[PDB]
């Protein structure tokens, strides 16, 4: 359940 | 009133320059952390951002999708607010888009929503995301395939009902085929999604076996790549955690010979995992 916030 | 609700009021403005400026600022705030995400939610941005997902204007659409995917990167209560606003039907519809930029961004928001609780993952399934996600596993576009794998792995990390919905959508034959991929990044993500399906019940672990995953997994143990090995071991160990019928299937696939050899590997993480997988099979 990995969450990703915006770029870089 | 305050600065943020004023920006929310400009999201339905007939002036597209005023609309884009406010949209660009709310998007920048929503990328600054959970506290800043809540300020955007409290100002009432979500119903307005959901309305912009239907826009034929790609410039408006790209910034609105960026804002929503970032709001969906916050806590479980914040993800629930995105669902309650009715974002999922619009997000699911954008999976059939021929625009690779819109498509990738729709995949970002959906995977972020699917990274929440079981009931939130179920809401993504009920919205009808699975047929499009399974179809995207056949894409020649490596970027779309990876985003679709990430979204599927997040859905497969759910409970019994969620894993069952992934199997019933025909995701296993496509995932087994992806084990024979020359792409190490795709291979890792397909192994991640398979490990999550194999983390379910004995019948679901058996569905992974019936799909023909074991011969590919056993062969991946002979890889000179330690990273691929760790991923393959994680998947096989999950299958090894099943019942006696499942344990016997791993033994017939010729895993014991490879796992015995992997106990003598230079890498300590490989040693521990292969010793643990062998413990599950022999007991
Ligand atoms: Ca207005
Ligand atoms: Ca105008
Ligand atoms: Ca247009
Ligand atoms: Ca295109
Ligand atoms: Ca390609
Ligand atoms: Ca390669
Ligand atoms: Ca190596
Ligand atoms: Ca372990």
PDB file of C-alpha atoms and ligand atoms in Angstrom:
ATOM      1  CA  UNK A   1       0.000   0.000   0.000  1.00  0.00           C
ATOM      2  CA  UNK A   2       2.648   2.576  -1.073  1.00  0.00           C
ATOM      3  CA  UNK A   3       1.480   6.220  -1.367  1.00  0.00           C
ATOM      4  CA  UNK A   4       3.322   8.718  -3.644  1.00  0.00           C
ATOM      5  CA  UNK A   5       3.263  12.519  -3.171  1.00  0.00           C
ATOM      6  CA  UNK A   6       3.982  14.731  -6.276  1.00  0.00           C
ATOM      7  CA  UNK A   7       7.269  14.590  -8.348  1.00  0.00           C
ATOM      8  CA  UNK A   8      10.818  13.922  -6.943  1.00  0.00           C
TER       9      UNK A   8
ATOM     10  CA  UNK B   1     -13.217  35.510   3.538  1.00  0.00           C
ATOM     11  CA  UNK B   2      -9.858  33.690   3.921  1.00  0.00           C
ATOM     12  CA  UNK B   3      -7.355  33.223   0.999  1.00  0.00           C
ATOM     13  CA  UNK B   4      -7.990  29.465   0.346  1.00  0.00           C
ATOM     14  CA  UNK B   5     -11.896  29.510   0.057  1.00  0.00           C
ATOM     15  CA  UNK B   6     -11.483  32.469  -2.385  1.00  0.00           C
ATOM     16  CA  UNK B   7      -9.233  30.246  -4.609  1.00  0.00           C
ATOM     17  CA  UNK B   8     -11.975  27.532  -4.440  1.00  0.00           C
ATOM     18  CA  UNK B   9     -14.543  30.180  -5.630  1.00  0.00           C
ATOM     19  CA  UNK B  10     -12.353  30.870  -8.743  1.00  0.00           C
ATOM     20  CA  UNK B  11     -12.503  27.167  -9.849  1.00  0.00           C
ATOM     21  CA  UNK B  12     -15.955  27.744 -11.491  1.00  0.00           C
ATOM     22  CA  UNK B  13     -15.092  31.276 -12.837  1.00  0.00           C
ATOM     23  CA  UNK B  14     -15.770  32.098 -16.551  1.00  0.00           C
ATOM     24  CA  UNK B  15     -12.216  33.609 -16.704  1.00  0.00           C
ATOM     25  CA  UNK B  16      -9.868  30.648 -17.563  1.00  0.00           C
ATOM     26  CA  UNK B  17      -6.721  32.652 -16.562  1.00  0.00           C
ATOM     27  CA  UNK B  18      -8.235  33.365 -13.081  1.00  0.00           C
ATOM     28  CA  UNK B  19      -9.287  29.664 -12.925  1.00  0.00           C
ATOM     29  CA  UNK B  20      -5.769  28.359 -13.843  1.00  0.00           C
ATOM     30  CA  UNK B  21      -4.008  30.713 -11.348  1.00  0.00           C
ATOM     31  CA  UNK B  22      -6.188  29.554  -8.380  1.00  0.00           C
ATOM     32  CA  UNK B  23      -5.941  25.904  -9.563  1.00  0.00           C
ATOM     33  CA  UNK B  24      -2.080  26.167  -9.714  1.00  0.00           C
ATOM     34  CA  UNK B  25      -1.910  27.606  -6.140  1.00  0.00           C
ATOM     35  CA  UNK B  26      -4.322  25.057  -4.514  1.00  0.00           C
ATOM     36  CA  UNK B  27      -2.293  22.280  -6.263  1.00  0.00           C
ATOM     37  CA  UNK B  28       0.987  23.691  -4.778  1.00  0.00           C
ATOM     38  CA  UNK B  29      -0.523  23.852  -1.223  1.00  0.00           C
ATOM     39  CA  UNK B  30      -1.875  20.225  -1.527  1.00  0.00           C
ATOM     40  CA  UNK B  31       1.722  19.030  -2.306  1.00  0.00           C
ATOM     41  CA  UNK B  32       3.121  20.490   0.959  1.00  0.00           C
ATOM     42  CA  UNK B  33       1.912  17.964   3.553  1.00  0.00           C
ATOM     43  CA  UNK B  34      -1.141  16.519   5.407  1.00  0.00           C
ATOM     44  CA  UNK B  35      -1.827  19.767   7.373  1.00  0.00           C
ATOM     45  CA  UNK B  36      -1.796  21.788   4.092  1.00  0.00           C
ATOM     46  CA  UNK B  37      -3.962  19.048   2.408  1.00  0.00           C
ATOM     47  CA  UNK B  38      -6.627  19.473   5.174  1.00  0.00           C
ATOM     48  CA  UNK B  39      -6.666  23.304   4.648  1.00  0.00           C
ATOM     49  CA  UNK B  40      -7.495  22.686   0.915  1.00  0.00           C
ATOM     50  CA  UNK B  41     -10.252  20.118   1.926  1.00  0.00           C
ATOM     51  CA  UNK B  42     -11.746  22.477   4.611  1.00  0.00           C
ATOM     52  CA  UNK B  43     -11.930  25.329   2.022  1.00  0.00           C
ATOM     53  CA  UNK B  44     -14.241  22.994  -0.006  1.00  0.00           C
ATOM     54  CA  UNK B  45     -11.915  22.324  -2.984  1.00  0.00           C
ATOM     55  CA  UNK B  46     -12.813  18.611  -3.513  1.00  0.00           C
ATOM     56  CA  UNK B  47     -16.393  19.084  -5.049  1.00  0.00           C
ATOM     57  CA  UNK B  48     -14.932  21.772  -7.386  1.00  0.00           C
ATOM     58  CA  UNK B  49     -11.829  19.638  -8.327  1.00  0.00           C
ATOM     59  CA  UNK B  50     -14.130  16.629  -9.111  1.00  0.00           C
ATOM     60  CA  UNK B  51     -16.207  18.876 -11.481  1.00  0.00           C
ATOM     61  CA  UNK B  52     -12.937  19.839 -13.323  1.00  0.00           C
ATOM     62  CA  UNK B  53     -12.179  16.093 -14.022  1.00  0.00           C
ATOM     63  CA  UNK B  54     -14.951  16.200 -16.702  1.00  0.00           C
ATOM     64  CA  UNK B  55     -13.395  19.266 -18.467  1.00  0.00           C
ATOM     65  CA  UNK B  56     -12.481  18.915 -22.198  1.00  0.00           C
ATOM     66  CA  UNK B  57      -9.599  21.360 -21.365  1.00  0.00           C
ATOM     67  CA  UNK B  58      -6.351  19.296 -20.886  1.00  0.00           C
ATOM     68  CA  UNK B  59      -4.582  22.299 -19.233  1.00  0.00           C
ATOM     69  CA  UNK B  60      -7.314  22.466 -16.510  1.00  0.00           C
ATOM     70  CA  UNK B  61      -7.502  18.597 -16.306  1.00  0.00           C
ATOM     71  CA  UNK B  62      -3.694  18.099 -15.698  1.00  0.00           C
ATOM     72  CA  UNK B  63      -3.581  20.569 -12.785  1.00  0.00           C
ATOM     73  CA  UNK B  64      -6.879  19.259 -11.240  1.00  0.00           C
ATOM     74  CA  UNK B  65      -5.637  15.596 -11.438  1.00  0.00           C
ATOM     75  CA  UNK B  66      -2.278  16.701  -9.892  1.00  0.00           C
ATOM     76  CA  UNK B  67      -4.146  18.377  -6.970  1.00  0.00           C
ATOM     77  CA  UNK B  68      -6.436  15.341  -6.336  1.00  0.00           C
ATOM     78  CA  UNK B  69      -3.613  12.738  -6.531  1.00  0.00           C
ATOM     79  CA  UNK B  70      -1.690  14.837  -3.932  1.00  0.00           C
ATOM     80  CA  UNK B  71      -4.781  15.110  -1.632  1.00  0.00           C
ATOM     81  CA  UNK B  72      -5.078  11.268  -2.022  1.00  0.00           C
ATOM     82  CA  UNK B  73      -1.425  10.943  -0.801  1.00  0.00           C
ATOM     83  CA  UNK B  74      -2.474  12.070   2.714  1.00  0.00           C
ATOM     84  CA  UNK B  75      -4.079  10.106   5.565  1.00  0.00           C
ATOM     85  CA  UNK B  76      -6.933   7.553   5.296  1.00  0.00           C
ATOM     86  CA  UNK B  77      -9.529  10.173   6.419  1.00  0.00           C
ATOM     87  CA  UNK B  78      -8.280  12.491   3.606  1.00  0.00           C
ATOM     88  CA  UNK B  79      -8.525   9.631   1.013  1.00  0.00           C
ATOM     89  CA  UNK B  80     -12.139   9.012   2.224  1.00  0.00           C
ATOM     90  CA  UNK B  81     -12.986  12.716   1.565  1.00  0.00           C
ATOM     91  CA  UNK B  82     -11.782  12.267  -2.104  1.00  0.00           C
ATOM     92  CA  UNK B  83     -14.145   9.208  -2.432  1.00  0.00           C
ATOM     93  CA  UNK B  84     -17.071  11.024  -0.666  1.00  0.00           C
ATOM     94  CA  UNK B  85     -16.649  13.911  -3.207  1.00  0.00           C
ATOM     95  CA  UNK B  86     -17.354  11.403  -6.049  1.00  0.00           C
ATOM     96  CA  UNK B  87     -13.895  11.404  -7.705  1.00  0.00           C
ATOM     97  CA  UNK B  88     -13.710   7.622  -8.468  1.00  0.00           C
ATOM     98  CA  UNK B  89     -16.231   7.465 -11.458  1.00  0.00           C
ATOM     99  CA  UNK B  90     -14.340  10.340 -13.198  1.00  0.00           C
ATOM    100  CA  UNK B  91     -10.944   8.713 -12.402  1.00  0.00           C
ATOM    101  CA  UNK B  92     -12.068   5.272 -13.735  1.00  0.00           C
ATOM    102  CA  UNK B  93     -13.408   6.866 -16.995  1.00  0.00           C
ATOM    103  CA  UNK B  94      -9.979   8.507 -17.632  1.00  0.00           C
ATOM    104  CA  UNK B  95      -8.335   4.995 -17.823  1.00  0.00           C
ATOM    105  CA  UNK B  96      -9.709   4.597 -21.401  1.00  0.00           C
ATOM    106  CA  UNK B  97      -8.092   7.953 -22.425  1.00  0.00           C
ATOM    107  CA  UNK B  98      -5.674   7.969 -25.434  1.00  0.00           C
ATOM    108  CA  UNK B  99      -3.738  10.821 -23.698  1.00  0.00           C
ATOM    109  CA  UNK B 100      -0.695   9.221 -21.910  1.00  0.00           C
ATOM    110  CA  UNK B 101      -0.257  12.279 -19.624  1.00  0.00           C
ATOM    111  CA  UNK B 102      -3.920  12.246 -18.410  1.00  0.00           C
ATOM    112  CA  UNK B 103      -3.792   8.401 -18.154  1.00  0.00           C
ATOM    113  CA  UNK B 104      -0.597   8.371 -15.952  1.00  0.00           C
ATOM    114  CA  UNK B 105      -2.103  11.038 -13.621  1.00  0.00           C
ATOM    115  CA  UNK B 106      -5.440   9.143 -13.338  1.00  0.00           C
ATOM    116  CA  UNK B 107      -3.333   6.030 -12.463  1.00  0.00           C
ATOM    117  CA  UNK B 108      -1.439   8.087  -9.760  1.00  0.00           C
ATOM    118  CA  UNK B 109      -4.693   9.166  -7.988  1.00  0.00           C
ATOM    119  CA  UNK B 110      -6.317   5.695  -8.234  1.00  0.00           C
ATOM    120  CA  UNK B 111      -3.203   3.899  -6.853  1.00  0.00           C
ATOM    121  CA  UNK B 112      -3.000   6.506  -4.001  1.00  0.00           C
ATOM    122  CA  UNK B 113      -6.713   5.930  -3.123  1.00  0.00           C
ATOM    123  CA  UNK B 114      -6.100   2.118  -3.343  1.00  0.00           C
ATOM    124  CA  UNK B 115      -3.220   2.529  -0.807  1.00  0.00           C
ATOM    125  CA  UNK B 116      -5.764   3.203   1.998  1.00  0.00           C
ATOM    126  CA  UNK B 117      -7.975   0.870   4.063  1.00  0.00           C
ATOM    127  CA  UNK B 118      -9.808  -2.261   2.772  1.00  0.00           C
ATOM    128  CA  UNK B 119     -13.190  -0.431   2.411  1.00  0.00           C
ATOM    129  CA  UNK B 120     -11.476   2.341   0.358  1.00  0.00           C
ATOM    130  CA  UNK B 121      -9.785  -0.269  -1.911  1.00  0.00           C
ATOM    131  CA  UNK B 122     -13.273  -1.866  -2.345  1.00  0.00           C
ATOM    132  CA  UNK B 123     -14.679   1.553  -3.461  1.00  0.00           C
ATOM    133  CA  UNK B 124     -12.044   1.566  -6.321  1.00  0.00           C
ATOM    134  CA  UNK B 125     -13.222  -1.988  -7.312  1.00  0.00           C
ATOM    135  CA  UNK B 126     -16.942  -0.912  -7.144  1.00  0.00           C
ATOM    136  CA  UNK B 127     -16.113   2.103  -9.391  1.00  0.00           C
ATOM    137  CA  UNK B 128     -14.949  -0.416 -12.068  1.00  0.00           C
ATOM    138  CA  UNK B 129     -11.163   0.204 -12.201  1.00  0.00           C
ATOM    139  CA  UNK B 130     -10.093  -3.506 -12.450  1.00  0.00           C
ATOM    140  CA  UNK B 131     -11.105  -4.282 -16.151  1.00  0.00           C
ATOM    141  CA  UNK B 132      -9.095  -1.264 -17.450  1.00  0.00           C
ATOM    142  CA  UNK B 133      -6.128  -2.028 -15.088  1.00  0.00           C
ATOM    143  CA  UNK B 134      -5.961  -5.710 -16.210  1.00  0.00           C
ATOM    144  CA  UNK B 135      -6.179  -4.550 -19.906  1.00  0.00           C
ATOM    145  CA  UNK B 136      -3.300  -2.046 -19.341  1.00  0.00           C
ATOM    146  CA  UNK B 137      -0.974  -5.004 -18.414  1.00  0.00           C
ATOM    147  CA  UNK B 138      -0.807  -5.714 -22.213  1.00  0.00           C
ATOM    148  CA  UNK B 139       0.328  -2.113 -23.065  1.00  0.00           C
ATOM    149  CA  UNK B 140       3.604  -1.684 -25.048  1.00  0.00           C
ATOM    150  CA  UNK B 141       4.066   1.601 -23.069  1.00  0.00           C
ATOM    151  CA  UNK B 142       6.401   0.663 -20.130  1.00  0.00           C
ATOM    152  CA  UNK B 143       5.358   3.768 -18.109  1.00  0.00           C
ATOM    153  CA  UNK B 144       1.593   3.004 -18.264  1.00  0.00           C
ATOM    154  CA  UNK B 145       2.238  -0.730 -17.496  1.00  0.00           C
ATOM    155  CA  UNK B 146       4.249   0.235 -14.324  1.00  0.00           C
ATOM    156  CA  UNK B 147       1.564   2.709 -13.087  1.00  0.00           C
ATOM    157  CA  UNK B 148      -1.156   0.046 -13.743  1.00  0.00           C
ATOM    158  CA  UNK B 149       0.948  -2.613 -11.884  1.00  0.00           C
ATOM    159  CA  UNK B 150       1.379  -0.189  -8.912  1.00  0.00           C
ATOM    160  CA  UNK B 151      -2.432   0.372  -8.811  1.00  0.00           C
ATOM    161  CA  UNK B 152      -3.139  -3.408  -9.053  1.00  0.00           C
ATOM    162  CA  UNK B 153      -0.558  -4.273  -6.302  1.00  0.00           C
ATOM    163  CA  UNK B 154      -2.252  -1.694  -3.991  1.00  0.00           C
ATOM    164  CA  UNK B 155      -5.693  -3.290  -4.662  1.00  0.00           C
ATOM    165  CA  UNK B 156      -4.215  -6.848  -4.176  1.00  0.00           C
ATOM    166  CA  UNK B 157      -2.753  -5.734  -0.792  1.00  0.00           C
ATOM    167  CA  UNK B 158      -6.347  -5.655   0.559  1.00  0.00           C
ATOM    168  CA  UNK B 159      -8.344  -8.411   2.268  1.00  0.00           C
ATOM    169  CA  UNK B 160     -10.076 -11.617   1.052  1.00  0.00           C
ATOM    170  CA  UNK B 161     -12.836  -9.800  -0.975  1.00  0.00           C
ATOM    171  CA  UNK B 162     -10.287  -7.418  -2.623  1.00  0.00           C
ATOM    172  CA  UNK B 163      -7.793 -10.186  -3.605  1.00  0.00           C
ATOM    173  CA  UNK B 164     -10.771 -12.266  -4.919  1.00  0.00           C
ATOM    174  CA  UNK B 165     -11.912  -9.282  -7.079  1.00  0.00           C
ATOM    175  CA  UNK B 166      -8.330  -9.115  -8.555  1.00  0.00           C
ATOM    176  CA  UNK B 167      -8.386 -12.895  -9.407  1.00  0.00           C
ATOM    177  CA  UNK B 168     -11.965 -12.720 -10.867  1.00  0.00           C
ATOM    178  CA  UNK B 169     -10.890  -9.766 -13.135  1.00  0.00           C
ATOM    179  CA  UNK B 170      -8.395 -12.203 -14.780  1.00  0.00           C
ATOM    180  CA  UNK B 171      -5.208 -10.518 -13.482  1.00  0.00           C
ATOM    181  CA  UNK B 172      -3.219 -13.755 -12.726  1.00  0.00           C
ATOM    182  CA  UNK B 173      -2.534 -15.046 -16.350  1.00  0.00           C
ATOM    183  CA  UNK B 174      -1.266 -11.538 -17.314  1.00  0.00           C
ATOM    184  CA  UNK B 175       0.890 -11.353 -14.130  1.00  0.00           C
ATOM    185  CA  UNK B 176       2.379 -14.873 -14.756  1.00  0.00           C
ATOM    186  CA  UNK B 177       3.297 -13.826 -18.360  1.00  0.00           C
ATOM    187  CA  UNK B 178       5.015 -10.664 -16.989  1.00  0.00           C
ATOM    188  CA  UNK B 179       7.406 -12.950 -14.994  1.00  0.00           C
ATOM    189  CA  UNK B 180       9.123 -13.709 -18.356  1.00  0.00           C
ATOM    190  CA  UNK B 181       9.709  -9.954 -18.991  1.00  0.00           C
ATOM    191  CA  UNK B 182      13.175  -8.598 -19.973  1.00  0.00           C
ATOM    192  CA  UNK B 183      12.323  -5.462 -17.895  1.00  0.00           C
ATOM    193  CA  UNK B 184      13.645  -5.675 -14.281  1.00  0.00           C
ATOM    194  CA  UNK B 185      11.341  -2.811 -13.117  1.00  0.00           C
ATOM    195  CA  UNK B 186       8.201  -4.516 -14.586  1.00  0.00           C
ATOM    196  CA  UNK B 187       9.367  -7.930 -13.169  1.00  0.00           C
ATOM    197  CA  UNK B 188       9.664  -6.427  -9.620  1.00  0.00           C
ATOM    198  CA  UNK B 189       6.126  -4.881  -9.795  1.00  0.00           C
ATOM    199  CA  UNK B 190       4.551  -8.101 -11.189  1.00  0.00           C
ATOM    200  CA  UNK B 191       6.321 -10.014  -8.333  1.00  0.00           C
ATOM    201  CA  UNK B 192       4.992  -7.372  -5.834  1.00  0.00           C
ATOM    202  CA  UNK B 193       1.361  -7.860  -7.136  1.00  0.00           C
ATOM    203  CA  UNK B 194       1.709 -11.696  -7.151  1.00  0.00           C
ATOM    204  CA  UNK B 195       3.102 -11.671  -3.542  1.00  0.00           C
ATOM    205  CA  UNK B 196       0.023  -9.650  -2.435  1.00  0.00           C
ATOM    206  CA  UNK B 197      -2.400 -12.161  -4.077  1.00  0.00           C
ATOM    207  CA  UNK B 198      -0.368 -15.030  -2.473  1.00  0.00           C
ATOM    208  CA  UNK B 199      -0.742 -13.216   0.915  1.00  0.00           C
ATOM    209  CA  UNK B 200      -4.453 -14.201   0.885  1.00  0.00           C
ATOM    210  CA  UNK B 201      -6.280 -17.438   1.728  1.00  0.00           C
ATOM    211  CA  UNK B 202      -5.278 -21.021   0.762  1.00  0.00           C
ATOM    212  CA  UNK B 203      -7.750 -21.056  -2.203  1.00  0.00           C
ATOM    213  CA  UNK B 204      -6.300 -17.705  -3.481  1.00  0.00           C
ATOM    214  CA  UNK B 205      -2.702 -19.074  -3.069  1.00  0.00           C
ATOM    215  CA  UNK B 206      -3.934 -22.143  -5.083  1.00  0.00           C
ATOM    216  CA  UNK B 207      -5.270 -19.783  -7.824  1.00  0.00           C
ATOM    217  CA  UNK B 208      -1.669 -18.386  -8.189  1.00  0.00           C
ATOM    218  CA  UNK B 209      -0.423 -22.053  -8.513  1.00  0.00           C
ATOM    219  CA  UNK B 210      -3.189 -22.938 -11.080  1.00  0.00           C
ATOM    220  CA  UNK B 211      -2.141 -19.816 -13.105  1.00  0.00           C
ATOM    221  CA  UNK B 212       1.323 -21.452 -13.571  1.00  0.00           C
ATOM    222  CA  UNK B 213       3.444 -19.081 -11.421  1.00  0.00           C
ATOM    223  CA  UNK B 214       5.635 -21.750  -9.670  1.00  0.00           C
ATOM    224  CA  UNK B 215       7.834 -22.850 -12.723  1.00  0.00           C
ATOM    225  CA  UNK B 216       8.666 -19.143 -13.407  1.00  0.00           C
ATOM    226  CA  UNK B 217       9.308 -18.472  -9.656  1.00  0.00           C
ATOM    227  CA  UNK B 218      11.568 -21.587  -9.287  1.00  0.00           C
ATOM    228  CA  UNK B 219      13.581 -20.501 -12.390  1.00  0.00           C
ATOM    229  CA  UNK B 220      13.955 -16.924 -10.959  1.00  0.00           C
ATOM    230  CA  UNK B 221      15.883 -18.515  -7.991  1.00  0.00           C
ATOM    231  CA  UNK B 222      18.752 -19.258 -10.462  1.00  0.00           C
ATOM    232  CA  UNK B 223      19.058 -15.510 -11.330  1.00  0.00           C
ATOM    233  CA  UNK B 224      22.473 -13.832 -10.722  1.00  0.00           C
ATOM    234  CA  UNK B 225      20.478 -10.694  -9.692  1.00  0.00           C
ATOM    235  CA  UNK B 226      20.138 -10.575  -5.840  1.00  0.00           C
ATOM    236  CA  UNK B 227      17.292  -7.977  -6.059  1.00  0.00           C
ATOM    237  CA  UNK B 228      15.163 -10.247  -8.372  1.00  0.00           C
ATOM    238  CA  UNK B 229      16.038 -13.195  -6.049  1.00  0.00           C
ATOM    239  CA  UNK B 230      14.721 -11.353  -2.919  1.00  0.00           C
ATOM    240  CA  UNK B 231      11.459 -10.492  -4.792  1.00  0.00           C
ATOM    241  CA  UNK B 232      11.076 -14.118  -6.068  1.00  0.00           C
ATOM    242  CA  UNK B 233      11.813 -15.489  -2.533  1.00  0.00           C
ATOM    243  CA  UNK B 234       9.165 -13.128  -0.998  1.00  0.00           C
ATOM    244  CA  UNK B 235       6.545 -14.501  -3.468  1.00  0.00           C
ATOM    245  CA  UNK B 236       7.472 -18.223  -2.969  1.00  0.00           C
ATOM    246  CA  UNK B 237       7.633 -17.838   0.860  1.00  0.00           C
ATOM    247  CA  UNK B 238       4.026 -16.452   0.772  1.00  0.00           C
ATOM    248  CA  UNK B 239       2.917 -19.541  -1.237  1.00  0.00           C
ATOM    249  CA  UNK B 240       4.923 -21.736   1.248  1.00  0.00           C
ATOM    250  CA  UNK B 241       2.749 -20.219   4.077  1.00  0.00           C
ATOM    251  CA  UNK B 242      -0.329 -21.964   2.580  1.00  0.00           C
ATOM    252  CA  UNK B 243      -1.805 -25.395   3.318  1.00  0.00           C
ATOM    253  CA  UNK B 244      -0.304 -28.883   2.721  1.00  0.00           C
ATOM    254  CA  UNK B 245      -1.808 -29.001  -0.828  1.00  0.00           C
ATOM    255  CA  UNK B 246      -0.012 -25.673  -1.620  1.00  0.00           C
ATOM    256  CA  UNK B 247       3.236 -26.790   0.181  1.00  0.00           C
ATOM    257  CA  UNK B 248       3.309 -30.031  -1.935  1.00  0.00           C
ATOM    258  CA  UNK B 249       2.853 -27.995  -5.194  1.00  0.00           C
ATOM    259  CA  UNK B 250       6.029 -25.960  -4.335  1.00  0.00           C
ATOM    260  CA  UNK B 251       7.923 -29.257  -3.601  1.00  0.00           C
ATOM    261  CA  UNK B 252       6.818 -30.722  -6.998  1.00  0.00           C
ATOM    262  CA  UNK B 253       7.989 -27.508  -8.781  1.00  0.00           C
ATOM    263  CA  UNK B 254      11.585 -28.271  -7.647  1.00  0.00           C
ATOM    264  CA  UNK B 255      12.071 -25.495  -5.056  1.00  0.00           C
ATOM    265  CA  UNK B 256      13.760 -27.535  -2.219  1.00  0.00           C
ATOM    266  CA  UNK B 257      16.977 -28.078  -4.278  1.00  0.00           C
ATOM    267  CA  UNK B 258      17.297 -24.315  -5.070  1.00  0.00           C
ATOM    268  CA  UNK B 259      16.333 -23.160  -1.511  1.00  0.00           C
ATOM    269  CA  UNK B 260      18.989 -25.527   0.018  1.00  0.00           C
ATOM    270  CA  UNK B 261      21.664 -23.914  -2.243  1.00  0.00           C
ATOM    271  CA  UNK B 262      20.394 -20.353  -1.414  1.00  0.00           C
ATOM    272  CA  UNK B 263      21.117 -20.990   2.333  1.00  0.00           C
ATOM    273  CA  UNK B 264      24.855 -20.748   1.359  1.00  0.00           C
ATOM    274  CA  UNK B 265      24.423 -17.399  -0.580  1.00  0.00           C
ATOM    275  CA  UNK B 266      26.822 -14.442   0.140  1.00  0.00           C
ATOM    276  CA  UNK B 267      23.847 -12.054   0.750  1.00  0.00           C
ATOM    277  CA  UNK B 268      22.469 -12.328   4.346  1.00  0.00           C
ATOM    278  CA  UNK B 269      18.898 -11.214   3.367  1.00  0.00           C
ATOM    279  CA  UNK B 270      18.752 -14.045   0.730  1.00  0.00           C
ATOM    280  CA  UNK B 271      20.059 -16.543   3.391  1.00  0.00           C
ATOM    281  CA  UNK B 272      17.358 -15.617   5.987  1.00  0.00           C
ATOM    282  CA  UNK B 273      14.447 -15.691   3.436  1.00  0.00           C
ATOM    283  CA  UNK B 274      15.454 -19.049   1.830  1.00  0.00           C
ATOM    284  CA  UNK B 275      15.964 -20.618   5.317  1.00  0.00           C
ATOM    285  CA  UNK B 276      12.466 -19.320   6.321  1.00  0.00           C
ATOM    286  CA  UNK B 277      10.846 -20.603   3.058  1.00  0.00           C
ATOM    287  CA  UNK B 278      12.475 -24.054   3.583  1.00  0.00           C
ATOM    288  CA  UNK B 279      11.196 -24.089   7.240  1.00  0.00           C
ATOM    289  CA  UNK B 280       7.578 -23.554   6.012  1.00  0.00           C
ATOM    290  CA  UNK B 281       7.814 -26.421   3.462  1.00  0.00           C
ATOM    291  CA  UNK B 282       9.598 -29.028   5.661  1.00  0.00           C
ATOM    292  CA  UNK B 283       7.206 -28.312   8.626  1.00  0.00           C
TER     293      UNK B 283
HETATM  294 CA1  LIG C   1     -17.243  31.452  -9.006  1.00  0.00          CA
HETATM  295 CA1  LIG C   2     -13.629  32.995 -20.641  1.00  0.00          CA
HETATM  296 CA1  LIG C   3      -9.303  20.146 -25.392  1.00  0.00          CA
HETATM  297 CA1  LIG C   4      -2.021   9.716 -27.344  1.00  0.00          CA
HETATM  298 CA1  LIG C   5       7.454   0.839 -25.305  1.00  0.00          CA
HETATM  299 CA1  LIG C   6      16.449  -5.501 -18.977  1.00  0.00          CA
HETATM  300 CA1  LIG C   7      24.690 -10.448  -8.681  1.00  0.00          CA
HETATM  301 CA1  LIG C   8      10.020 -13.598   5.993  1.00  0.00          CA
END
